[PDB]
Structures are given as C-alpha cells and as structure tokens.
Amino acid sequence: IIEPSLRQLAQKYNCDKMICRKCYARLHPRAVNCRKKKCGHTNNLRPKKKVK
Amino acid sequence: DRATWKSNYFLKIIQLLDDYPKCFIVGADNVGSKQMQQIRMSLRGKAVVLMGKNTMMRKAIRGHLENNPALEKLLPHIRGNVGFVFTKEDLTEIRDMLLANKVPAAARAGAIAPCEVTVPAQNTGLGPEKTSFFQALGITTKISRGTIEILSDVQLIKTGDKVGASEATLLNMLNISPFSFGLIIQQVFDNGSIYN
Amino acid sequence: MKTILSNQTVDIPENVDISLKGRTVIVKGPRGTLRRDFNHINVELSLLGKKKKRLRVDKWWGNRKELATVRTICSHVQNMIKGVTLGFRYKMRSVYAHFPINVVIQENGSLVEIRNFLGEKYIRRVRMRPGVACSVSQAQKDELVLEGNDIELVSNSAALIQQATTVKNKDIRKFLDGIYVSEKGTVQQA
Amino acid sequence: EIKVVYLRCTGGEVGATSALAPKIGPLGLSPKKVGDDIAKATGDWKGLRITVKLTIQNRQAQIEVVPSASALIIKALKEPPRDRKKQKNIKHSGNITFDEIVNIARQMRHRSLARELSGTIKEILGTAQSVGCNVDGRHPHDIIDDINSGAVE
RNA sequence: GAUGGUGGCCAUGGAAGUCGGAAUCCGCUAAGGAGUGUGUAACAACUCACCUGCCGAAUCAACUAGCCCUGAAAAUGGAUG
Ligand SMILES: [Mg+2]
Ligand SMILES: [Zn+2]
Numbered sequence A: 001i002i003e004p005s006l007r008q009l010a011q012k013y014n015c016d017k018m019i020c021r022k023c024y025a026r027l028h029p030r031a032v033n034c035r036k037k038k039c040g041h042t043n044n045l046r047p048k049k050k051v052k
Numbered sequence B: 001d002r003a004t005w006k007s008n009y010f011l012k013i014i015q016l017l018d019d020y021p022k023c024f025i026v027g028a029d030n031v032g033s034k035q036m037q038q039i040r041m042s043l044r045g046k047a048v049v050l051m052g053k054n055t056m057m058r059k060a061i062r063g064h065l066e067n068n069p070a071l072e073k074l075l076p077h078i079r080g081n082v083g084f085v086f087t088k089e090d091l092t093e094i095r096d097m098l099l100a101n102k103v104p105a106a107a108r109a110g111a112i113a114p115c116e117v118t119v120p121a122q123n124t125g126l127g128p129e130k131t132s133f134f135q136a137l138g139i140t141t142k143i144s145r146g147t148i149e150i151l152s153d154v155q156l157i158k159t160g161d162k163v164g165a166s167e168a169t170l171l172n173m174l175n176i177s178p179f180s181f182g183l184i185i186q187q188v189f190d191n192g193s194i195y196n
Numbered sequence C: 001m002k003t004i005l006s007n008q009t010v011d012i013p014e015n016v017d018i019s020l021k022g023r024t025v026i027v028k029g030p031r032g033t034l035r036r037d038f039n040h041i042n043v044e045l046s047l048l049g050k051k052k053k054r055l056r057v058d059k060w061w062g063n064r065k066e067l068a069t070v071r072t073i074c075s076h077v078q079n080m081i082k083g084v085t086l087g088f089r090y091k092m093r094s095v096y097a098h099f100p101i102n103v104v105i106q107e108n109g110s111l112v113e114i115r116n117f118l119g120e121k122y123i124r125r126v127r128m129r130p131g132v133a134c135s136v137s138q139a140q141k142d143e144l145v146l147e148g149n150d151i152e153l154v155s156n157s158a159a160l161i162q163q164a165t166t167v168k169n170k171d172i173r174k175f176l177d178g179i180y181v182s183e184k185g186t187v188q189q190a
Numbered sequence D: 001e002i003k004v005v006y007l008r009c010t011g012g013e014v015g016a017t018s019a020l021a022p023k024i025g026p027l028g029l030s031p032k033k034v035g036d037d038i039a040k041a042t043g044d045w046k047g048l049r050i051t052v053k054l055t056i057q058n059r060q061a062q063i064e065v066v067p068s069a070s071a072l073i074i075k076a077l078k079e080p081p082r083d084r085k086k087q088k089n090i091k092h093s094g095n096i097t098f099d100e101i102v103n104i105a106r107q108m109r110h111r112s113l114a115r116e117l118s119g120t121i122k123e124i125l126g127t128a129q130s131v132g133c134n135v136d137g138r139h140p141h142d143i144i145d146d147i148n149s150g151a152v153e
Numbered sequence E: 001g002a003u004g005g006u007g008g009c010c011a012u013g014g015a016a017g018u019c020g021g022a023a024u025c026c027g028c029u030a031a032g033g034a035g036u037g038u039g040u041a042a043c044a045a046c047u048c049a050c051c052u053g054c055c056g057a058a059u060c061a062a063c064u065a066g067c068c069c070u071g072a073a074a075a076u077g078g079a080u081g
Helices: A004-014 B003-019 B033-042 B054-064 B072-077 B093-100 B134-137 B165-174 C064-085 C149-163 D021-023 D032-042 D069-076 D097-109 D118-129 D139-146
Strands: A018-020 B023-026 B047-050 B083-087 B116-120 B139-142 B148-150 B152-159 B185-190 C006-013 C018-021 C026-030 C031-034 C044-045 C054-059 C086-095 C101-108 C111-115 C122-128 C131-134 C144-148 C178-185 D002-009 D049-056 D059-066
Touching: A004 C086, A004 C178, A018 D002, B003 B047, B003 B054, B003 B083, B023 B093, B033 B047, B033 B134, B054 B072, B072 B185, B116 B152, B134 B165, B152 B165, B165 C131, C006 C064, C026 C064, C031 C064, C031 C144, C054 C064, C111 C149, C122 C149, C131 C149, C131 D097, C144 C149, C149 C178, D002 D021, D002 D032, D032 D049, D032 D059, D097 D118, D118 D139
Parallel strands: none
Antiparallel strands: B023 B083, B023 B185, B047 B083, B139 B148, C006 C054, C018 C026, C026 C031, C044 C054, C086 C144, C086 C178, C101 C111, C111 C122, C131 C144, D002 D049, D049 D059
16 A cells, blocks of 8 residues: 555654653654653653554 | 683784784675684684784784784785684685685675676466565566466666665575675785785 | 863865855855855854865853854854755655645746645645755656755755645554655765 | 475374475375374384474475484483373473483584584583583583593594 | 574473573684564564774763752732832
C-alpha cells in the first residue's frame, strides 16, 4: 500500500519521537531531558509506543 | 586488564618480529571474522597473521629501532585497517595461496556494492510461499513445477550501490553472493626491501 | 568564568568575495549577492590578510552563554558561502496511502497549490518567501525541489508546506501522509 | 544430482511430530519411511537431542548422525532416562574421568573445525560445566591441569 | 568488523541469547559478554558491550552547595508602600 522507505521517512517526522512524562512534549529521538521549561526540564522520558 | 593487555601485546609483537625477517603488510579491510578465522586456522602451520592497533605497532617499531635499524620503512606503510602476516617458506607461494583462499562473503544491507551483482533467469527451488519478497522488488516472475521461475535477468545493483535489506534477503534466499573480499596486501618486506 | 579571548576563523574560497560593513556581512558570488545582519550578537569581525583568504570572529570576556555565539556565526557565514557559491537544493517527497497529492506550481515557483490531500476538497496554497524557487522534478514520480541561497528561507518554505500537509484529529502513527523533506542537498556539486 | 538436508531428531524414538514431510515433501521422496529409519538407525541415544544429515539422491537417501559435543558428553554421563512422566530438574550429576574426554575430542576434531588436542579438551571442559557435571571438581580445579600437569597427547 | 565449541544445561507446545531458575567457560582471537536491547508463533534480521579505520588535546562520571525555574489553584481590581 506504500513504499517502505517513504513510510520510514514519514516515521522519522511522526513516529520515532521521545515524549516527556510530564507535560507530554514531543522531542527528538536522541533526547535526554525535556525542552519545555513548563515541566522543569525533567529527565524521565518514554519512547512513544509505536503501532501494533 | 588493559595495562597487562598492552604489555604482553608488546612482548608478543617483539617476539613475532624477532624470528620473522620477512613479512607482508596486509590490509584486512572488510573481511568477516568467519573468513579470517578459517584462513588463519587453515594456514596456521605455514604462516602467522597478526592484527592490532596501528599506533601501538608503530611505537613498538620505534621502540625496537635501537636494535633493528631497518624497520623505519614499515612506519609510513602503517595506516588504515592494516596488519602483518609472517612466514618463512618462500617468497610468492603464500601470496598465491592468499589470492586463492578468498571466500565470497554474504551481502550485508548497508554496505556498498563492490562490482556487478545481478541474477540470471532460472527456475529456483524456493517455492510459491515466498513470493512477497519478489513483489517487494517488483521483479515480474512466474511459478512453474512448484517453484519460482525468473523470466529475465536484471541488474538489481550496479557497481557502487547501497545494499538494501530487500535485496540482501533475496540474495540470501537465492544463495548467491558475488561479494568476495579477501587479502588486499599492499607491500612486502624482505630483509629491507619493498615489493608490490 | 570569563574567557579572555575566544576566536574562530573561516576560510574563504577564491571565487567568492565577502566584505564587512561594521558588524553585518555581505557575500558576493557566482549565483548572486547575499547579506546578513549581526547587530544583536556583539562580537568582532576581522577580514585579516590580503586577498581575503580568512575571516576571524572573536569575543573577549564572555560567559559560556555568549562564547557559544562565537562559532554559530562561523556556521552562518560558511553556510552562507555555500549557499552563494553552490546554492541550496532541498528535495522533499510526497507520501500518501490512497489519495494522490496533486501539487501545482504557480507564478514560477512563488506559489504552490496542494490538492487531494487525504481526499479533502480544501486547496492548500502556500506562498514561498522571496528568494526561493519551487519546481516538481523529473525522473521521479512525486518530488518537490526548492532552490535558494539562504538556508533559513529555503528550509522555512519547506517547513511551511510540510506543516500545511498535516493530519489532525486522527492517529499520526498510522496516517503517515504529507510532504516530508527527504534529502538536504546542493544545487551544484563540487 | 545429490542433495544434502539437515534435520533434528529426538533420538531412537520415532518422531511423532511430522517434521520430515515439510522437508522431504517437495522432492517427492517418502518421508515416513525415512523418519523411522533414522530413529532406528540412531537407536542408542534414545533420550537425547540428535542432529542427522541426510544425503538424499534422486533414488534413495543415506542416513548418518552429525556428532555433537553436548550429545556426546550427555551420553557419556550415563544415567537412567526418564519416561513420558517427564518431571522437572533432571540436572545431571556425575563425575566423568579424563580418559574418555580425549576420545570424544577425537570426534570433535574429526570434522576439523577446532585447534589441536590441547585446545579441544579445554573447549569440551567448558561443555562439562555447561552440562553441570564435574570431573572430580569444577573448571577452576580443572584449569591448572593444563598448566604444567597435563595428561594430553 | 562483532566467530566457533554450541541451537551449552533444567528447560517447553514452539524457545537458535533476547518469555523464565540456577551455570556463565575454552579455541581463533587486535574482539566478541553462553550476552544490553529492537523484534520473530521461532528462526532469520537490526542493535549494544568489546576490538579496529579517519581527525588529534584534553574527556567522563556521582555527590554537593549558591541565584533562578517547575512544583505553586479562589473568588469587587491590587500592591517589595
Ligand atoms: Mg480517532
Ligand atoms: Zn517536559
């Protein structure tokens, strides 16, 4: 239904993100702490569970 | 630990150079461990091939220069993933043996294609249950005698192409891998001489 | 602490010529002339040596929050020099599942109209900022090429159309649709 | 045309799970008359995991067992096998001497993918602690033997 | 580049390292951990530790105290005077 390289290209801008636990910000995949100062730049992050 | 690992390596490179006044400076580039292990295991009785850190080998050379004033020629020739192989049997017999011991390696997805990989049209023995991988590449094929029949040949990858996962798996299924990497030895040291 | 001196130098190709008017810089090359203002960074720029081979940017007695600004100017200048000697070419590909994305170029690349995005009848018209040119490339099914001189304008235009091609009120982890920047490239290869 | 196919059987018992059909089916040779032949040809193991290579031609197949270090050491550690009851914790306890270790290493070097005898006895001594039995002691005791007190050819 | 003994052994319906309980070693080794993870009904495949190729001067970690920030939500418009 779609070409895999194009699919992963769309994933690189929509899927492989890191989400801050608090504030739920969307961050770059190689993140350490949240960009937002709203949550206080906390350290705990999650890998944004993909689609099953 | 690392401290003794450096010291005994210094001991074993000095000892190896003591009894072998003849060597080939061999660049073991893009060679699989499986191929290197079988080559070394087969050729252990005739020769010993040693690899290691280039910056450590050159310091060992400069440390032993006080007793061997003819080791300076090796210093400019140590750069890149290049090691040494020692033998005392003949001059070119091992060179021919190394040229003949090359093994075709599998096609890894992500490595550039060395040269001219293609697939001829033939009736394989894979079966009808694995046509989804051919549909990924878009290769038009038919099914005959219970297996997959290739209609026409195709140059899937040119010389100097990135190998994808779909092509690599297809090559693995067909048990064909023109990728052959062996010894690409550069120079020969023999009692203060350099040979191509 | 405050570092006494922090400087970096940038090489200048012979085909290009760069001059300084106070703190702003102007670069003239084969493709054209591009200018940029740095009146908010408070550094020193020196075009040392004849035949303008090197440009040195230094700062004296700066904290770590401002010593970082010394090298970002070097990147800006070298990126600008690349954009004037060779230019910037951003190639972005349209990704869709069922509905094809109809991209039409108007007023010689100034305006891009997007139709049939997720099948909706709404037409998305995005106006490129001045200084860039858009064209649907050949030798490919779906591809858009943005050619320009300054990365800010080129990538801002690419961001504009990419953000325009968005799916809302749905799961973006499945509806992988839109025009996405695939490769960052150069108009002229060295 | 000569074909070679590798299969895994459970010893002298006839394989209840039909795994010969997926392999021997495509060529047309009858797999049911070969699976039982392999089981009776192995025979002696009768309680272990066995790998068998099959040299199948266009007419008939040839049966021979591929040696395995784990399969040889477990049959060397002779113990009463457990039947269908199949309880837990059959962790083997025993003390196999060094004499038969050498001849098992002979079979290990028969196909010639190894170092010489002194290295093969060490790499099969590793299999000893892999299984669980000890040669009158563990490998910490059985390492010093290779140092100045060896009994290897 | 990242291997064999070996798909180590209790293991289980299928468990090749990636669900589990105890082991957790030898050869070739510059290096490969009976293994950190992504996945596989499970295999394959990707990837980490570790070793090398290129540039070459400094680089990590864990605490700790200062200022600032999140934590930090009430009603007539509002108070370092
Ligand atoms: Mg919804
Ligand atoms: Zn946050």
